[PDB]
Paper text:
We present a robust protocol based on iterations of free energy perturbation (FEP) calculations, chemical synthesis, biophysical mapping and X‐ray crystallography to reveal the binding mode of an antagonist series to the A2A adenosine receptor (AR). The first integrated approach of ligand and residue FEP simulations was published by Boukharta et al. to characterize antagonist binding to the Y1 neuropeptide receptor, which we later expanded to other GPCR families, including the related neuropeptide receptor Y2,12 the orphan receptor GPR13913 and several members of the family of adenosine receptors. Among the latter, the adenosine A2A receptor (A2AAR) was one of the first GPCRs to be crystallized and today stands out as one of the better characterized GPCRs from a structural perspective. Many A2AAR antagonists have been developed targeting a number of pathologies, including recent clinical candidates in immuno‐oncology. In the same HTS campaign, a series of chromones were identified as a novel family of A2AAR antagonists, and consecutively optimized to yield the potent and selective Chromone 14.30 At that point, the lead‐optimization program was successful in improving the affinity of the initial HTS hit, while not focusing on pharmacokinetic optimization (i.e., the most potent compound Chromone 14 contains a metabolically unstable ester group).
Subsequent X‐ray crystallography of the A2AAR with a low and a high affinity chromone derivative confirmed the predicted binding orientation. The structures were obtained following the in meso soaking approach, and could be refined down to a resolution of 1.92 and 2.13 Å respectively. The two structures show clear positive omit density at 1σ for the presence of the chromone compounds in the orthosteric binding site, in both cases adopting binding mode A. The structure with the high affinity ligand 4 d shows outstanding agreement with the computational model with an RMSD of 0.67 Å between the docked and experimental poses, and is indeed highly similar to previously reported binding modes of the compound. The core of the scaffold is anchored by an H‐bond between the nitrogen in the 4‐methylthiazole ring (coplanar with the chromone scaffold) and N2536.55, and complemented by a π‐π stacking with F168EL2, in line with the binding pattern observed for many other A2AAR antagonists. The ester at position R7 is stabilizing the Glu1695.30–His2647.29 ionic pair, which closes the EL2‐EL3 interface, while the propyl at R6 makes contacts with Tyr2717.53 and Met2707.52. Given the good resolution of the structure, we could observe a well‐defined water network of the interface between the carbonyl moiety of the chromone core and the receptor. While most water positions are conserved as compared to the A2AAR‐ZM241385 complex, ligand 4 d displaces a number of water molecules observed in the first hydration shell around that ligand.
Numbering used by the authors: 0 to 208, 1001 to 1042, 1062 to 1106, 219 to 305
The structure:
């Protein structure tokens, strides 16, 4: 069949994707700009990512449509049209990695997060990452290309002019660059690193939330030990342990009271007065009920929110991998298996479209998983 028919479907689909990528991502950018509760370091990378997606719609998609035609062009101009999407993908990878790291810093060392991760450091990092993205993505423009070996038969058949080639992705971009440099080195490795960071984030969270329960359990069991003791020494044992575990957990009024009360009881227990120390240890229950238990519930609630936010970020990264992998895998087959028939055109189109679809998905994930974005989206849309 005439190429314009299958080309028509592909183009239409690309155009639809472009519209959706632009709309959703402009909305993300708008939400961050308007809502000061969304203005934080994590979200600056979210905006960088959104910008990359906007550019997929504005530029990468129109470029992809263009290159699908195999139009006559100067080889280097053709390279730009072919590789610009790689710049966008690379930037996305950097943003994704930054978000994972940012969340790891928040969970591992929350006391030092604000002084370490600032808005100014973030903007500089974003700038650097875009520069690096251009370098990586446009590496073929620096000389790793097939412009030195033009397919002159193909160019002459299409009536191309001198110094021009039929602009086709696989004719100008070397597959070794695509597979070894782009896929393995610049996409695969960072994604694996991201996986590693997420694993550490979830482990740190799981460990902290066990530790909170342990401390609590230690306060309750040592209380019971004090109640059932027969001598001062047993009481002194259980309170010394308790004092250590009160401080660990406090590493304000309520904890001052708690430690003070343990000290009261300990002094009584060091004087041999068992019954008085036990009654004194009983007052600890009042401090636990109205102070310590509230600290435990808030600390646990803060951790769960961090796990929820980390899962939301991980999903985004997972989705990027899912959307891009098929295309990369196809490139691997093309490159590693020259005896294998090339993947059919329809599959190529499908793989490309899927890759482009990744630029649509983030706004939905934010809307469904993050309440503050969702509420802001509604307001923007309502207003
Ligand atoms: C990342 C997840 C979703 C897995 C996706 C795997 C996809 C990309 C895999 C699964 C089966 C694969 C195909 C298996 C057989 C062939 C025949 C060969 O002549 C060309 C490549 C081609 C057509 C492969 C292209 C890539 C392929 C379609
Ligand atoms: C953790 C995962 C997602 C990383 C990506 C796995 C990739 C690199 C793997 C998965 C399936 C693999 C392919 C499976 C089969 C063939 C056909 C063979 O004639 C050449 C290698 C080739 C083409 C492999 C290249 C590498 C490959 C594409
Ligand atoms: C999923 C992750 C861990 C990657 C898995 C990669 C696997 C599928 C890759 C790695 C090395 C690859 C093999 C390397 C060499 C050859 C010789 C070639 O004449 C036929 C394909 C064959 C036999 C490949 C089949 C696919 C292969 C086994
Ligand atoms: C949603 C996404 C904006 C500015 C220009 C857009 C127009 C871009 C398209 C212009 C293409 C012109 C063209 O290809 O002309 C070929 C020539 O006529 C054959 O010899
Ligand atoms: C030649 C054809 C291609 C050219 C196409 C134009 C080039 C677009 C490139 C980069 C824009 C990147 C924008 C990144 C926006 C993120 C900014 C941000 O997040 O702000 C942080 C905040 O200011 C902290 O206080
Ligand atoms: C923003 C939109 C960008 C679309 C960019 C599309 C670039 C269109 C190039 C088409 C072109 O230059 O065709 C003329 C002919 O091939 C020369 O001999
Ligand atoms: C980053 C590392 C992760 C995955 C690499 C997977 C390695 C895939 C290696 C494929 C090698 C291969 O296919 O060799 C066949 C050879 O060309 C005979 O014709
Ligand atoms: C079908 C339309 C033109 C075309 C495009 C590309 C393309 O954009 C990529 C890419 N890979 C990545 C990781 C980013 S972009 C790979 O192979 C292609 C092959 C193509 O044409 C073929 C199959 O011969
Ligand atoms: C997501 C939606 C996927 C549907 C269509 C993607 C484009 C498929 C184009 C088919 C072209 C057939 C051909 O030219 O051989
Ligand atoms: C295309 C790139 C658009 C960049 C949008 C920046 C929005 C600023 C912000 O939300 O802080
Ligand atoms: C919208 C993207 C613009 C597509 C232009 C393709 C031109 C190809 C050609 O001139 O043959
Ligand atoms: C709005 C954009 C609509 C049409 C422009 C895209 C079509 C450009 C010519 C493609 C020809 C081809 O696919 O061979
Ligand atoms: C914030 C946006 C940052 C953009 C900075 C641009 C950095 C450019 C760095 C490397 C890209 C090199 C591409 C070479 C183009 C060759 C063009 C030609 O053929 O003349
Ligand atoms: C750093 C800068 C590296 C990019 C320098 C410009 C590359 C131009 C390549 C070319 O025109 O062939
Ligand atoms: C590889 C390993 C992957 C690890 C991933 C790491 C994360 C874990 C035109 C239409 C216009 C109308 C618009 C709509 C109007 C309403
Ligand atoms: C719908 C999604 C289809 C995805 C994978 C199916 C594999 C397609 C392979 C068919 C091409 C094989 C060939 O003839 O070269
Ligand atoms: Na992206």
């Amino acid at each position: 069949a005439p190429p314009i028919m299958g080309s028509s479907v592909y183009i239409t689909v690309e155009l639809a994707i472009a519209v959706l990528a632009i709309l959703g991502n402009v909305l993300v950018c708008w939400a961050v700009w308007l809502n000061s509760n969304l203005q934080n370091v994590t979200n600056y990378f979210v905006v960088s990512l959104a910008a990359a997606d906007i550019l997929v719609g504005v530029l990468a998609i129109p470029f992809a449509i263009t290159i699908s035609t195999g139009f006559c062009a100067a080889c280097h101009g053709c390279l730009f049209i072919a590789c610009f999407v790689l710049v966008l993908a690379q930037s996305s990878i950097f943003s994704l990695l930054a978000i994972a790291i940012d969340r790891y810093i928040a969970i591992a060392i929350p006391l030092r997060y604000n002084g370490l991760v600032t808005g100014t450091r973030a903007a500089g990092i974003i700038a650097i990452c875009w520069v690096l993205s251009f370098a990586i993505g446009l590496t073929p423009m620096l000389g790793w290309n097939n412009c030195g070996q033009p397919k002159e038969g193909k160019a002459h058949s299409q009536g191309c002019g001198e110094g021009q080639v039929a602009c086709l992705f696989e004719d100008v971009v070397p597959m070794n660059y695509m597979v070894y440099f782009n896929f393995f080195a610049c996409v695969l490795v960072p994604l694996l690193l991201m996986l590693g960071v997420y694993l550490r984030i979830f482990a740190a969270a799981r460990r902290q939330l066990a530790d909170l329960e342990d401390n609590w359990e230690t306060l309750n069991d040592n209380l019971k030990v004090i109640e059932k003791a027969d001598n001062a020494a047993q009481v002194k044992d259980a309170l010394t342990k308790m004092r250590a575990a009160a401080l660990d957990a406090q590493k304000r009024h309520g904890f001052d009271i708690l430690v003070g009360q343990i000290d009261d009881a300990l002094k009584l227990a060091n004087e041999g007065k068992v019954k008085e120390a036990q009654a004194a240890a009983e007052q600890l229950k009042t401090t636990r009920n109205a102070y310590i238990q509230k600290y435990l519930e808030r600390a646990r609630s803060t951790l769960q929110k961090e796990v929820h936010a980390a899962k939301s970020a991980a999903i985004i990264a997972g989705l990027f991998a899912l959307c891009w992998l098929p295309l990369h895998i196809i490139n691997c087959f093309t490159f590693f298996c020259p005896d294998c028939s090339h993947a059919p055109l329809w599959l190529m189109y499908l793989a490309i479209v899927l890759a482009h679809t990744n630029s649509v998905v983030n706004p939905f994930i934010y809307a469904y998983r993050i309440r503050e974005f969702r509420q802001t989206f509604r307001k923007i849309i309502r207003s």
